[PDB]
Design an enzyme around this catalytic site. Structure first.
Site, PDB file in Angstrom:
ATOM      1  N   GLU A 142      -0.732 -15.635  -0.128  1.00 50.02           N
ATOM      2  CA  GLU A 142      -0.906 -14.187  -0.198  1.00 50.02           C
ATOM      3  C   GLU A 142      -2.359 -13.799  -0.001  1.00 50.02           C
ATOM      4  O   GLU A 142      -2.657 -12.790   0.644  1.00 50.02           O
ATOM      5  CB  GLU A 142      -0.433 -13.641  -1.540  1.00 50.02           C
ATOM      6  CG  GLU A 142       1.094 -13.585  -1.773  1.00 50.02           C
ATOM      7  CD  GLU A 142       1.809 -12.579  -0.885  1.00 50.02           C
ATOM      8  OE1 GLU A 142       3.037 -12.734  -0.683  1.00 50.02           O
ATOM      9  OE2 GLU A 142       1.136 -11.679  -0.328  1.00 50.02           O
ATOM     10  N   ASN A 164      -0.609  -1.612   4.264  1.00 53.66           N
ATOM     11  CA  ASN A 164       0.736  -1.693   4.821  1.00 53.66           C
ATOM     12  C   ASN A 164       1.032  -0.483   5.706  1.00 53.66           C
ATOM     13  O   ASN A 164       0.363   0.551   5.632  1.00 53.66           O
ATOM     14  CB  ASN A 164       1.778  -1.779   3.707  1.00 53.66           C
ATOM     15  CG  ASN A 164       1.544  -2.956   2.794  1.00 53.66           C
ATOM     16  OD1 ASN A 164       1.369  -2.792   1.590  1.00 53.66           O
ATOM     17  ND2 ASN A 164       1.515  -4.146   3.367  1.00 53.66           N
ATOM     18  N   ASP A 200       3.358   1.709   5.613  1.00 54.20           N
ATOM     19  CA  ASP A 200       3.730   2.934   4.914  1.00 54.20           C
ATOM     20  C   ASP A 200       2.557   3.593   4.193  1.00 54.20           C
ATOM     21  O   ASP A 200       2.772   4.545   3.436  1.00 54.20           O
ATOM     22  CB  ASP A 200       4.876   2.659   3.932  1.00 54.20           C
ATOM     23  CG  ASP A 200       4.458   1.787   2.753  1.00 54.20           C
ATOM     24  OD1 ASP A 200       3.317   1.284   2.738  1.00 54.20           O
ATOM     25  OD2 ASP A 200       5.286   1.593   1.838  1.00 54.20           O
ATOM     26  N   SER A 217       0.653   2.257   1.853  1.00 49.79           N
ATOM     27  CA  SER A 217       0.310   1.563   0.621  1.00 49.79           C
ATOM     28  C   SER A 217      -0.605   0.376   0.928  1.00 49.79           C
ATOM     29  O   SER A 217      -0.782  -0.028   2.082  1.00 49.79           O
ATOM     30  CB  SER A 217       1.583   1.107  -0.092  1.00 49.79           C
ATOM     31  OG  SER A 217       2.201   0.069   0.644  1.00 49.79           O
ATOM     32  N   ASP A 246      -1.908  -3.641  -0.563  1.00 48.80           N
ATOM     33  CA  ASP A 246      -1.733  -4.789  -1.456  1.00 48.80           C
ATOM     34  C   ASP A 246      -3.092  -5.240  -1.985  1.00 48.80           C
ATOM     35  O   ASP A 246      -4.062  -5.288  -1.228  1.00 48.80           O
ATOM     36  CB  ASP A 246      -1.073  -5.968  -0.730  1.00 48.80           C
ATOM     37  CG  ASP A 246       0.271  -5.616  -0.132  1.00 48.80           C
ATOM     38  OD1 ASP A 246       0.981  -4.777  -0.710  1.00 48.80           O
ATOM     39  OD2 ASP A 246       0.613  -6.181   0.922  1.00 48.80           O
ATOM     40  N   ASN A 257       1.281  -4.382  -4.821  1.00 45.74           N
ATOM     41  CA  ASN A 257       1.383  -3.236  -3.925  1.00 45.74           C
ATOM     42  C   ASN A 257       1.263  -1.913  -4.680  1.00 45.74           C
ATOM     43  O   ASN A 257       1.842  -1.736  -5.760  1.00 45.74           O
ATOM     44  CB  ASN A 257       2.718  -3.309  -3.175  1.00 45.74           C
ATOM     45  CG  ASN A 257       2.892  -2.183  -2.185  1.00 45.74           C
ATOM     46  OD1 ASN A 257       3.458  -1.150  -2.509  1.00 45.74           O
ATOM     47  ND2 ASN A 257       2.403  -2.379  -0.975  1.00 45.74           N
ATOM     48  N   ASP A 276      11.817  -8.054 -12.724  1.00 43.68           N
ATOM     49  CA  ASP A 276      12.511  -6.824 -12.361  1.00 43.68           C
ATOM     50  C   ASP A 276      13.882  -7.046 -11.742  1.00 43.68           C
ATOM     51  O   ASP A 276      14.556  -6.063 -11.422  1.00 43.68           O
ATOM     52  CB  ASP A 276      11.659  -5.978 -11.401  1.00 43.68           C
ATOM     53  CG  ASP A 276      11.582  -6.553  -9.980  1.00 43.68           C
ATOM     54  OD1 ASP A 276      10.672  -6.117  -9.246  1.00 43.68           O
ATOM     55  OD2 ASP A 276      12.382  -7.431  -9.580  1.00 43.68           O
TER      56      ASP A 276
END
Ligand code: NA
Length: 129
Positions: free
Chosen positions: A35, A46, A48, A50, A52, A59, A101
């Site tokens: 990562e 990203n 959209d 957003s 990281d 994110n 989650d």
């Protein structure tokens, strides 16, 4: 800060990641390698809008506030810049919330594509621990 492999493994062990929700320590070290290349200051934007953040590339659409991801959540209740610290506590504590989650470590695309199904314990071999 750019961590060493065994140095990061020791830090994540101290913070309780070894076998957390069933994921052995090697999984977490493998995820961090692909990562972020073990770099706490890594950032990536990203499509959209957003971004990281940090050694586990958490994110801003869901997990932290960076002031520029409109209509996003801040489920770890933390500014995204806190994820860039040489202290990995904030990143580890937020990752515990993510992996809990429902989707496990599949939330990390690099783990799914480059760690899942491999000999992840290789990532902590030679380390004292
Ligand atoms: Na956010």
């Amino acid at each position: 800060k750019v961590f060493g492999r065994c140095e990061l493994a020791a830090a994540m062990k101290r913070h309780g990641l070894d076998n957390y929700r069933g994921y052995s320590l090697g999984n977490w070290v493998c995820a961090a390698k692909f990562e972020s290349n073990f770099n706490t200051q890594a950032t990536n934007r990203n499509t959209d809008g957003s971004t990281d953040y940090g050694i586990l590339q958490i994110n801003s659409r869901w997990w932290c506030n960076d002031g520029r991801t409109p209509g996003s959540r801040n489920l770890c209740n933390i500014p995204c810049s806190a994820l860039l610290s040489s202290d990995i506590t904030a990143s580890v504590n937020c990752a515990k919330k993510i992996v809990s989650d429902g989707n496990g470590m599949n939330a990390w695309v690099a783990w799914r594509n480059r760690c899942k199904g491999t000999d992840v314990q290789a990532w902590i071999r030679g380390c004292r621990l």
